[PDB]
Amino acid sequence: ALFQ
Amino acid sequence: ELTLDPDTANPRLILSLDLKGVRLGERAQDLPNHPCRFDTNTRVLASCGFSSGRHHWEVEVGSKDGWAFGVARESVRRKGLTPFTPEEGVWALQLNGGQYWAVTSPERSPLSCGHLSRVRVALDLEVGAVSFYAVEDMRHLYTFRVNFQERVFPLFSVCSTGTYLRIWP
């Protein structure tokens, strides 16, 4: 999710 | 119709031959450095952006976690890890943790909308809004009200294997  | 723009895409993403579909691949492709390429966040834009008028498209969505889509202002930051937030110029829905979210900030807004298969995006640059509807009954999912002040591009992100997004007209 951090890299969305 | 809209197509995904390969030179924007994070090199881990895989774009379909017809440039309508995107998923996350197994490793980073060896692609040219381009200042417009998202080098860390798993994003890709369409090749066409909009500065006026009203525009619709549809996005078929996977049932498994890991996608987000909507619109981004052209000036969205491409290099390094950046927040996925309205302040950074992204206005999106997301499927994560088995829940659908409107990506508001500082806290996301959980949507009690039921299962989604395909979503219609309605961008209105005249009034300043982007809205999302589930196509089976056109129920309203979320609207961001934004005074857009630059060109706005369709935005797609896939940060996990096993899911996908696909553009339809």
In whole angstroms, what separates CA B49 from the centre of its chain?
13
Instruction: Say which CATH topology domain B6-168 has.
Output: Jelly Rolls (2.60.120)
Q: Which of B40, B81, B159 sits opposite A1 (nearest CB)?
A: B159
* Domain residue extents for chain B: 6-168
| Resolution limit, Å | 1.4
Q: Nearest residue of B to residue A3 by CA position? A: B41
Angle subtended at Cα B138 by Cα B85 and Cα B119, rounded to the nearest 5 degrees: 45
DSSP per-residue letters across B45-101: EBS--BSSSEEEEEEEE-SSS-EEEEEEETT---SS----SGGGTEEEEEEETTEEE
Contacts of A2 in chain B (CB under 8 A): 81, 159
Check if B13 contacts A (Cβ < 8 Å).
no
Determination method here? X-ray
Contact A4 B159 (CB under 8 A): yes
Of B121, B113, B7, nearest to B59 by C-alpha is B121
Contact B42 A3 (CB under 8 A): yes
